[PDB]
Structures are given as C-alpha cells and as structure tokens.
Design a protein around this ligand. Structure first.
Ligand SMILES: [Mg+2]
Ligand SMILES: [Mg+2]
Ligand SMILES: [Mg+2]
Ligand SMILES: [Mg+2]
Ligand SMILES: [Mg+2]
Ligand SMILES: [Mg+2]
Ligand SMILES: [Mg+2]
Ligand SMILES: [Mg+2]
Ligand SMILES: [Mg+2]
Ligand SMILES: [Mg+2]
Ligand SMILES: [Mg+2]
Ligand SMILES: [Mg+2]
Ligand SMILES: [Mg+2]
Ligand SMILES: [Mg+2]
Ligand SMILES: [Mg+2]
Ligand SMILES: [Mg+2]
Ligand SMILES: [Mg+2]
Ligand SMILES: [Mg+2]
Ligand SMILES: [Mg+2]
Ligand SMILES: [Mg+2]
Ligand SMILES: [Mg+2]
Ligand SMILES: [Mg+2]
Ligand SMILES: [Mg+2]
Ligand SMILES: [Mg+2]
Ligand SMILES: [Mg+2]
Ligand SMILES: [Mg+2]
Ligand SMILES: [Mg+2]
Ligand SMILES: [Mg+2]
Ligand SMILES: [Mg+2]
Ligand SMILES: [Mg+2]
Ligand SMILES: [Mg+2]
Ligand SMILES: [Mg+2]
Ligand SMILES: [Mg+2]
Ligand SMILES: [Mg+2]
Ligand SMILES: [Mg+2]
Ligand SMILES: [Mg+2]
Ligand SMILES: [Mg+2]
Ligand SMILES: [Mg+2]
Ligand SMILES: [Mg+2]
Ligand SMILES: [Mg+2]
Ligand SMILES: [Mg+2]
Ligand SMILES: [Mg+2]
Ligand SMILES: [Mg+2]
Ligand SMILES: [Mg+2]
Ligand SMILES: [Mg+2]
Ligand SMILES: [Mg+2]
Ligand SMILES: [Mg+2]
Ligand SMILES: [Mg+2]
Ligand SMILES: [Mg+2]
Ligand SMILES: [Mg+2]
Ligand SMILES: [Mg+2]
Ligand SMILES: [Mg+2]
Ligand SMILES: [Mg+2]
Ligand SMILES: [Mg+2]
Ligand SMILES: [Mg+2]
Ligand SMILES: [Mg+2]
Ligand SMILES: [Mg+2]
Ligand SMILES: [Mg+2]
Ligand SMILES: [Mg+2]
Ligand SMILES: [Mg+2]
Ligand SMILES: [Mg+2]
Ligand SMILES: [Mg+2]
Ligand SMILES: [Mg+2]
Ligand SMILES: [Mg+2]
Ligand SMILES: [Mg+2]
Ligand SMILES: [Mg+2]
Ligand SMILES: [Mg+2]
Ligand SMILES: [Mg+2]
Ligand SMILES: [Mg+2]
Ligand SMILES: [Mg+2]
Ligand SMILES: [Mg+2]
Ligand SMILES: [Mg+2]
Ligand SMILES: [Mg+2]
Ligand SMILES: [Mg+2]
Ligand SMILES: [Mg+2]
Ligand SMILES: [Mg+2]
Ligand SMILES: [Mg+2]
Ligand SMILES: [Mg+2]
Ligand SMILES: [Mg+2]
Ligand SMILES: [Mg+2]
Ligand SMILES: [Mg+2]
Ligand SMILES: [Zn+2]
Lengths: 99, 99, 208, 83
RNA sequence: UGGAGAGUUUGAUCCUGGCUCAGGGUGAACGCUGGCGGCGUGCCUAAGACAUGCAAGUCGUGCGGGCCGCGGGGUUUUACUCCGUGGUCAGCGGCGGACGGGUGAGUAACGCGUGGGUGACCUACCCGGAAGAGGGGGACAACCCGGGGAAACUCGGGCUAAUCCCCCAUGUGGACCCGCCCCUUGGGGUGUGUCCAAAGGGCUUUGCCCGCUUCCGGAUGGGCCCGCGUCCCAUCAGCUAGUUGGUGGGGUAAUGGCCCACCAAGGCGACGACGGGUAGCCGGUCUGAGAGGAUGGCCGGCCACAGGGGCACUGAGACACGGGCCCCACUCCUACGGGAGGCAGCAGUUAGGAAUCUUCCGCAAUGGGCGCAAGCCUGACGGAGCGACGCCGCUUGGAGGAAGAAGCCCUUCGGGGUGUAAACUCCUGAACCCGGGACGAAACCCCCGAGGAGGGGACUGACGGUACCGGGGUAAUAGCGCCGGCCAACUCCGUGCCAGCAGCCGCGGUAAUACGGAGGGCGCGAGCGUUACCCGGAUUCACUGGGCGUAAAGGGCGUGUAGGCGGCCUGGGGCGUCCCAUGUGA
C-alpha cells in the first residue's frame, strides 16, 4: 500500500512553512515600511524599507516568491514609499532610493 | 500582423471607450451571392477624441477590459451620421417586436 | 474456392462450349456435344428472352466461371480495373490473365486451369527461383515461370510437355518447351485475346 | 528536453523506425518536430537507412541529446566524422 | 474518367405524388453453418459497484545511522578498530511522480479547427556565450529513552550529517525607485541610490570528469489574446448588478471586472441575444457523378474528467486518476474513542445489456524515469492468447469415365432430369512425422587515440525449436439465401381465406411456379441470411437541380420600415473579384 510518495508530501509540509515564513516577513516589514513612511520619519521609513527590499530578493533565491514577482513587490513597495515620504517630507537618508 | 478594421463609431457614451460597427462581406458557402453581416467592437480611446459618426481604423490590441481588445487607429472621415442613422433605425424596429 | 461440384454443367447454362475440362472438352463431350441445352428438369423447353438483367448477368457468370475464381476476388479486380487508367474492359481481362494459375494454362503446363491451380498451389511451379504457390500471384512482365527441380520429371507434367511440342501459343508469351519454362513478354492486348465474352456487358452489370 | 530517437512504424513483426526529433515527453508513435530519416532493423532493402546529416547537424547544434540506439545510426551513418 | 431504375392511384391514359425495393456502409448483434492461416479489431449499455496481482520510481559519485557477510595489517597480541567492503531497509537530501496509460461525464465555449497577436508572458533537464565559487553559524528525521493507542498511528525528551536552512563578503551581472536618450503599449542602453549569488562529490593528482551560482542567448513545451468556421426549437423575444465602461488598488508568469473600493450609465439582441434540448472537437471515416449528406470507433492532435463537489500545499510545471484537506454517497475494520478505501491503468469480477477477450509472456526490441556507469522499475510498449467481428491469402482435389449406373423426382408411358455427377483407374499431396532453424541486435559497455572523431574487440531474443528451409506422407470440412412480379432461377404433391407468407403490389376460399415438403434450378460460398442505423436511389428541400390557373402551394387589398436588387458616360481608389509569387496547410 505504502507508495513512498509520502516523502514528497512530508517534504512539502516542511517547505510550506519555510516560505510561508519568509513571505509573511515580506508583508509585515513591508507594512511597517509604508507605515513609518507616511507618518513622516523618512530615514527610519527607508531603514525598514531596506531589510524590506533585502528580504524580498532573498526569498527569490529559492522556490518561494520568484520570477519578476520578486520585483513587482519592489516596483510597488518602494514606489509607494517614495510617494509618501514625498508628502511634504524629503529624501532624508540615502535610502534604497536614488534621488 | 495585428488585424485591423474600418467601422463607424456608434456610441461614445462610454468613459474612454467607443462602439465601432464593422460590416464585412463574403459569399454564402452554398448560395454564393455575396452576403453582408456585421459586428460591434469595443475600442479604446484614452483621449476621448473620436466622436460619434467617425469612421475609424481599429487595431487588435492588448486587452483593456472585458470587451476591449482593439484601439482606435485613425480617423477616415468626420460627418457620416447617415450610417449611424441606419444602425439606430435597425435598433429601433426591435422595440416593436416583443409582446 | 472453385465449385468443386459438377462442372461440365455450366457449359450447359451459358450455352457456350467451355474448357474447364481438358482432353474431354475437346473430345465429343464438354458435357455439351451430346447435351447442348441447360441443366435441370426444364431447359430443354423453349427458353425466354433474358431481361436486360439476365443478359448482363449471364455474361458475367460466363467470364467469371471461365477462370473458376472467387467472386469477391473477381469483383475486386473489376474495381481495381477502374482504379487505373486506360480502358477498364480490357485491363480487367488483361489483369485476369496475369494470374499465375492462368499462366500455367496459357503456357499449358496443364490441361485445365483447375488442374493448373493444383500444380501451382502444390509448389510444382516457380518464378525466378522461388517456389510460388499463390494462385493469385500477379505475373508482371518478364519472369521465368519455370518448373521446379523436384518437379521437372513429373508424370502429369511430361504428358502435357510431350503434348506441348510445337503448337504456337500466346503472342504475349514464349515457351522454352525443352527447359520447361516460359516468359511473360508483355500484358495481353485485347486483340491478342479471344474469349466467348463481351467485356462491355460485364462492366454494365457491375453498375447494377 | 528535446530528443532524437526512433519512432516505430509499419505492421507487427515488421518494424520500421523513423529517427525523429520530438520532445522527450511526446509518446512514441507521436507527433514530432521533424523527420530526419527512416531506418530498418531488418534491412529487407538496400536502403536500410538514410539521414539528413545536414539538419541532424542542426538539432545537435541547438542541443538535443538523441537516444543511444540512435547514435548507433548517426555514427554508423557519418555525422561526427570531420577528419 | 463520372450520373441506369423498378413495382404500386385507373376499365385504360398522361401527369402530380407518396409509399416500396435492388447498392454500398458498421466497434455490430441475432439465426443455420463453420477447416487454415496472416494483418487488423473487440463494454456502443451503468462516468454502475469492484475481490486478488501487478501498473513509478530511482541515486552509496548529496548525508548520517539500524542491520549484515568477508578481510587484514598496526601493538609478539590482548582491548580491537578503521577502512576497503558488498549487500541491504528506512531516514534525511536530489530528480521523476504534471510523462506515459484510461474515459467522453460535462462542455454550444476561444472547447475545437484555422490563421494571426504578446511593447502583456513563463519554460525543469538540453545546447551555446560571459562571470564567479571567500568565511562563519544552525535545525530536523534516522537513532536513544519515556508516554498514549485495538488498530491507524502518535506526543514528548536528547544527540547528529549533508549538495538541507541561515548569515556577512566579492557583483560578471541581474531586480527596483527616480532621471536621460533611443524606441514606441511594459522593447533597448546608461547614470546615481539600494538589493540579491553559490554545494560539494568523485577518481587514474599535478589534471580531467559529475555538479553549484548570477546573467544573456538558443531550442522545446506552454499561459493569455483576437478575425474567421463550429447543432435543433422563435410554440424561447427580449436579456443583463460585476451587469458595460472609467479611475485607483489587489492578484498572476502575464493581459483582463479575474477579484475589491469609488464613480459613470451603460453592455447585448430577428445578422437570433436569453432560455430549452442535444453533443467532446479535429485530421479523418462512410456514402454520393458531384455539390451534398451522415459521422468522429480504432489511429494522431486538442479538450475535459478520475464516485459527486470544494479546495489549496509542494513545484519550472498541477489545484495533480494510483498526492493532501473538507462535505456527501458507498464498502470494509474497530477494543465504539476511532480508522481504511477509490480500475474511466493492465487482467479479472459482478451489474445491466442484443453484445465485447487472457487474472498470459518479456524488458530482447523501441520509448521513458533515475543514475558516472554497471543497472533498477517501466501492464507504455514488444508479443502470445480467445470471438469468421472485419480485410486478405488457402484448403476440402487434378486428369480421364456411359447415349449416361442404382436411387429419387417428372412422364403424352417412347422418354426426360440429376449427370461425368458418382462408381473405377491413374497423377498431385492440406493435415500429419523427421531434420535444420533465424532476421528483428548493435549499441551502452572493452584496448589505440584523448573517455572526442576514427577502427577494432565481446555479451544480450520474450515471440520460439514458431517463421522459413529440406525429407517422408494420408483424397482430405459445405453451407446458407432465394426461385410470382421488381429479381437470376419450374414442376410435383399436400393444404383449401385453414395452415401460413410479406419489402411493396399481394398470395392461399380444389386444380397454388406466392403456403409447406420434393426434384430440379439460380446466387454465393467458410460463409450465407435476418434485424438495427447512416448515405444512395430521392431532381422526395432542388446551390448544383424543383415548384404554385385547376394536382400541395400567391399573402383578401394597400401603404411603407429594414433588407435585397438597380439605367447611360468620364475619371480617382482598388473593397469584392482575378493572377503571380511566398509562409501555412504536421
Ligand atoms: Mg479505368
Ligand atoms: Mg485519359
Ligand atoms: Mg463508378
Ligand atoms: Mg394497387
Ligand atoms: Mg504472428
Ligand atoms: Mg466505456
Ligand atoms: Mg556502500
Ligand atoms: Mg552501503
Ligand atoms: Mg554525482
Ligand atoms: Mg549504509
Ligand atoms: Mg568488550
Ligand atoms: Mg565506532
Ligand atoms: Mg493504447
Ligand atoms: Mg476508448
Ligand atoms: Mg445550450
Ligand atoms: Mg468560439
Ligand atoms: Mg466565435
Ligand atoms: Mg491556435
Ligand atoms: Mg496556423
Ligand atoms: Mg568576459
Ligand atoms: Mg553543524
Ligand atoms: Mg557542520
Ligand atoms: Mg547577504
Ligand atoms: Mg558594473
Ligand atoms: Mg550583496
Ligand atoms: Mg550579500
Ligand atoms: Mg558559499
Ligand atoms: Mg542550497
Ligand atoms: Mg557554506
Ligand atoms: Mg590529489
Ligand atoms: Mg466579471
Ligand atoms: Mg455610487
Ligand atoms: Mg455529452
Ligand atoms: Mg452525452
Ligand atoms: Mg464536402
Ligand atoms: Mg456528430
Ligand atoms: Mg460533427
Ligand atoms: Mg472506445
Ligand atoms: Mg481513441
Ligand atoms: Mg480518439
Ligand atoms: Mg472528483
Ligand atoms: Mg467507477
Ligand atoms: Mg474530488
Ligand atoms: Mg498525481
Ligand atoms: Mg486530488
Ligand atoms: Mg487507480
Ligand atoms: Mg468486532
Ligand atoms: Mg467483527
Ligand atoms: Mg479502547
Ligand atoms: Mg467512520
Ligand atoms: Mg522472466
Ligand atoms: Mg527496455
Ligand atoms: Mg511485467
Ligand atoms: Mg458465431
Ligand atoms: Mg455470425
Ligand atoms: Mg439414373
Ligand atoms: Mg431413368
Ligand atoms: Mg472429376
Ligand atoms: Mg472425382
Ligand atoms: Mg484406388
Ligand atoms: Mg513438402
Ligand atoms: Mg540441434
Ligand atoms: Mg575504460
Ligand atoms: Mg526441428
Ligand atoms: Mg534439435
Ligand atoms: Mg503465427
Ligand atoms: Mg513437406
Ligand atoms: Mg424470371
Ligand atoms: Mg391445414
Ligand atoms: Mg396445388
Ligand atoms: Mg394462378
Ligand atoms: Mg411453389
Ligand atoms: Mg416469393
Ligand atoms: Mg438526396
Ligand atoms: Mg437531395
Ligand atoms: Mg432553384
Ligand atoms: Mg415538384
Ligand atoms: Mg390575389
Ligand atoms: Mg473606377
Ligand atoms: Mg491606380
Ligand atoms: Mg492532405
Ligand atoms: Zn466440358
């Protein structure tokens, strides 16, 4: 009966978590980014937008988030960040953005 | 080559969208006599330039919406309401058919 | 295969002298010389004008019976005839002739075709070295329709050989009576043929 | 990946492969990208092989591991001989 | 290079017009009969229910152990060990389980076919080109202990490896924000800012192979998109709330109302929307002179489904038939808490049905998967098996023998027919027995060179002691339909509108070529008939090719919408139309 395709299954479980994990970090850091972004604090906003950008591409090196979806995240993320710091603020610290 | 069509614009009531009607013609598979049929296409017009009664080149395009997969290429002649006359008349004899 | 039953009997329905028998049919008795009428209780009474059917029918049954051959096979050939170019009526016949068991008759290695079939089928014949026994075997032009080694000195083989001396046969053929072997010159012209049969009437019936 | 192999054909007991470039997946007697020449295990005729070495050169060129018993008819058919 | 008609309305006639037959066709079935092979083919019904076996795994050159067999030096040896080591069965780890194989339920729709689009896209392994591989840390199974449990399994506690996880560096390069040029839908280059690499494993060591990482190209496979083609009912005529479009966002590999918030009031429809019925589509197949009609079994392509329905996880790829979770139905186990299962894979069961096979053989071939290879599994496949289901080849004999046996039919009592038919003689020699016996198989693998090109060297065949070849060798299965007309093929008896026949016209009420039996004949033969359905005949939906005074058929008459159709001459474009080339039409 026991077709050891189970190994394939047990594997997937271990997998699921591992990138579920990476993925949620994306989100929460991503939020805590746009958050501090709008609020005003820029050098802090970006400083988080940093380990943001990082954690994204990092998830890219494997089976998790991949392709240019690794990018689409950034293309919008920092895209939103800039726009908000833009609200009366200014490119305080040399964040992940070029002025 | 991205297929292209001339048909008259037949409605402008849409936001950045236009209804274009295009008679093709062809010969009946058994009866030869060239017959005429027509279809409406939902063109895109981000400049809201084209008005009613315009005759237009329409190009197969990247999908804009549920029904728009063409965009307006170029005008061919302004004043030709006489044709929309027809499309309206046709569309009005209907109301006198129901029960 | 061939209606093994009474055969000096068909000659009688068609009413034409037919050479299914060998010596005897040449004698006074193809069944026919003594009894020129059709078989059965009747047939000796005044027959009636065959409908356009009977005619096209009986003519078919003639040319078919002459080769003692499978209707399905015949029917097939008739159609193969239309498959290819030319005058169908001829090639049909021309094609009938290509039949190996028909050659061992035109080349006379036997008195009958039914006899001819036996020998062919029994491996007694051969072609270019191989012991063909397929009556069907279509003879293409130009091939040693010889006789086999174990066979050459055979009882009923010789009695037909010593009887096969001289007597010219087949303009579309050639017989090395000594070496016991013939050749297929070419495909039998219509004129080269002479059968008691109207080809044009057999085509008719094969349209129903 | 893409492949180059024998595609059986012709009746029972009468094999008659067809040496072709398919995708590895395609079933055996399947659809295929192109024909690069027949073959016969029995050699009933003097023509018991053939290969458009020209285009074969091509498919190997754009990368395309063939079968093993298909090399056996590319070598023994002269494709890798440059001298 | 291809086209036939007949019977039947009448006392008879011509015409109109139905009905009916002869033809071909099948995944066939049923009847009577049935010898041999070859290549095909075989659940059309309940996408009903399935016992048992087998259908997908593989790598010790990713890692660490449980187990087990062999061996030895080193220390005189003891304690032995480590390694070489081969085998294992599990575990982690990698690649494959999405291919292959089954079936048409659903689906009338970009599902399919066909031709294009993607500046809106991905693509494992393969191929090509560039670059790079420095250091450090950690977890969890196996295993050990403990615990619960009928079972299924499972909780905890403690170690440990790695091509598993993670971190900092180098950044060829790539991703992103913004800015510039080129380009023109999101294409290409550059600049500043940030972000992201990596894994070791082998042998014959001064080296090569299997691998890793980033990136660009290549090929192949695929997502998406559009023009056009794709069934019956108008006694279905109006349809539409994500409905149509916009703006911004979410999602994806990517476009899109695919999903959400906000706004606008749209979108569709007699050129048939909406509904209802029906159905997988195609290359093709059948039929037909052809136009046309019918059709999608087998084979190949595409689609869809895996008891019904929903779902996502892993992944380059699936929402995955032999993976997972949930509900419903169904079967089984249970220690009543619980648990297991999915043949529309091969084969086989049962059920229903007019009806559809062997629980075979083999990886030798071809193909696939993994692997450095040796090799392992491959019910794909290659074969064998059973059914005249189909097409094709073959057989049941060949020659000679009577004015012509016996029997049996008919008979004007002379005779006729079966009938060369048999008998008999001769010749041949299916079956059967003996011998020999493959092709399908030369590659991976071994030396030269260099593991390359090039040559040479060996193993391996399920089918099968079959095919085929030589020797011996026995005359050695015939059946079914019809015989009134169409329609080939006549008489005798019985029967007496009874028994029965039939496709239609009709036949049988004493003298039947129409019923049944006979002799005889006709047709065709391992087949012959019946029934069913498709095309033809049917020019009987008529484009090819029909009609409407009385045969069926002119709207009771106008007036007009849409639609269809449109005079004479010059000219522009060239939409149809035509011609040429070119891609495509697997
Ligand atoms: Mg012809
Ligand atoms: Mg000609
Ligand atoms: Mg014809
Ligand atoms: Mg009548
Ligand atoms: Mg065989
Ligand atoms: Mg079925
Ligand atoms: Mg080992
Ligand atoms: Mg070991
Ligand atoms: Mg390795
Ligand atoms: Mg071990
Ligand atoms: Mg001890
Ligand atoms: Mg130890
Ligand atoms: Mg199959
Ligand atoms: Mg099927
Ligand atoms: Mg429908
Ligand atoms: Mg469609
Ligand atoms: Mg369509
Ligand atoms: Mg397409
Ligand atoms: Mg195309
Ligand atoms: Mg360089
Ligand atoms: Mg460690
Ligand atoms: Mg370590
Ligand atoms: Mg880092
Ligand atoms: Mg640089
Ligand atoms: Mg870095
Ligand atoms: Mg780094
Ligand atoms: Mg590293
Ligand atoms: Mg790694
Ligand atoms: Mg490391
Ligand atoms: Mg070394
Ligand atoms: Mg919607
Ligand atoms: Mg509102
Ligand atoms: Mg259906
Ligand atoms: Mg159905
Ligand atoms: Mg047609
Ligand atoms: Mg159909
Ligand atoms: Mg169809
Ligand atoms: Mg089927
Ligand atoms: Mg099929
Ligand atoms: Mg099919
Ligand atoms: Mg299901
Ligand atoms: Mg089932
Ligand atoms: Mg389900
Ligand atoms: Mg699966
Ligand atoms: Mg599933
Ligand atoms: Mg299964
Ligand atoms: Mg119990
Ligand atoms: Mg019990
Ligand atoms: Mg209990
Ligand atoms: Mg239960
Ligand atoms: Mg075995
Ligand atoms: Mg194999
Ligand atoms: Mg097996
Ligand atoms: Mg039977
Ligand atoms: Mg039968
Ligand atoms: Mg007698
Ligand atoms: Mg008598
Ligand atoms: Mg005789
Ligand atoms: Mg006899
Ligand atoms: Mg005797
Ligand atoms: Mg013999
Ligand atoms: Mg021997
Ligand atoms: Mg070596
Ligand atoms: Mg033997
Ligand atoms: Mg022997
Ligand atoms: Mg055989
Ligand atoms: Mg013999
Ligand atoms: Mg008659
Ligand atoms: Mg009676
Ligand atoms: Mg009577
Ligand atoms: Mg009478
Ligand atoms: Mg009678
Ligand atoms: Mg009758
Ligand atoms: Mg018709
Ligand atoms: Mg018609
Ligand atoms: Mg007409
Ligand atoms: Mg008429
Ligand atoms: Mg009138
Ligand atoms: Mg002009
Ligand atoms: Mg001009
Ligand atoms: Mg063609
Ligand atoms: Zn005679």
């Amino acid at each position: 009966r026991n077709l050891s395709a189970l190994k394939r299954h047990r594997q997937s479980l271990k997998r699921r978590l591992r990138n579920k994990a990476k993925k949620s970090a994306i989100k929460t850091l991503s939020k805590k980014a746009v958050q501090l972004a709008q609020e005003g604090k820029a050098e802090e906003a970006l400083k988080i937008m940093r380990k943001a950008e990082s954690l994204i591409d990092k998830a890219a090196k494997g089976s998790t988030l991949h392709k240019n979806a690794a990018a689409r995240r950034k293309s919008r993320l920092m895209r939103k960040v800039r726009q908000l710091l833009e609200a009366a603020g200014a490119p305080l610290i040399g964040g992940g953005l070029s002025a | 080559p991205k297929k292209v069509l001339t048909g008259v614009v037949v409605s402008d009531k849409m936001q950045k969208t236009v209804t274009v009607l295009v008679e093709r013609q062809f010969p009946h598979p058994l009866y030869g006599k060239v017959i005429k049929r027509s279809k409406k296409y939902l063109a895109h017009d981000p400049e809201e330039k084209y008005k009613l009664g315009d005759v237009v080149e329409i190009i197969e395009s990247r999908p804009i919406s549920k029904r728009k997969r063409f965009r307006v290429l170029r005008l061919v002649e302004s004043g030709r309401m006489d044709l929309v006359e027809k499309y309206l008349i046709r569309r009005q004899n209907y109301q006198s058919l129901s029960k | 295969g061939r209606y093994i039953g009474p055969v000096c009997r068909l000659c009688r329905r068609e009413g034409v002298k037919l050479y299914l028998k060998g010596e005897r049919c040449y004698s006074p008795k193809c069944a026919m010389e003594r009894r020129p009428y059709p078989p059965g209780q009747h047939g000796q009474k005044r027959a009636r004008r065959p409908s356009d059917y009977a005619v096209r029918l009986r003519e078919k049954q003639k040319l078919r019976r002459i080769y003692g051959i499978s209707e399905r096979q015949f029917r097939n050939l008739f159609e193969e005839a239309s498959k290819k170019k030319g005058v169908t009526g001829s090639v049909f016949l021309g094609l009938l002739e290509s039949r190996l068991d028909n050659v061992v008759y035109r080349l006379g290695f036997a008195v009958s075709r039914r006899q001819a079939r036996q020998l062919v089928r029994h491996g007694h014949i051969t072609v270019n070295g191989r012991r063909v026994d397929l009556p069907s075997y279509r003879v293409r032009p130009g091939d040693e329709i010889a006789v086999a080694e174990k066979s050459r000195n055979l009882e009923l083989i010789r009695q037909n050989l010593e009887a096969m001396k001289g007597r010219k046969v087949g303009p579309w053929l050639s017989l090395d009576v000594e070496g016991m072997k013939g050749k297929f010159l070419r495909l039998p012209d219509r004129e080269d043929l002479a059968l008691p049969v109207n080809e044009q009437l057999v085509i008719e019936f094969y349209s129903r | 990946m893409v492949k180059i192999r024998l595609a059986r054909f012709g009746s029972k007991h009468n094999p008659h492969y067809r040496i072709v470039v398919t995708d590895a997946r395609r079933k055996r007697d399947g659809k295929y990208i192109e024909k690069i020449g027949y073959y016969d295990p029995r050699k009933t005729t003097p023509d018991w092989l053939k290969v458009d070495v020209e285009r074969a050169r091509y498919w190997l060129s754009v990368g395309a591991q063939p079968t093993d018993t298909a090399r056996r008819l590319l070598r023994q058919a002269g494709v890798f001989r440059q001298e």
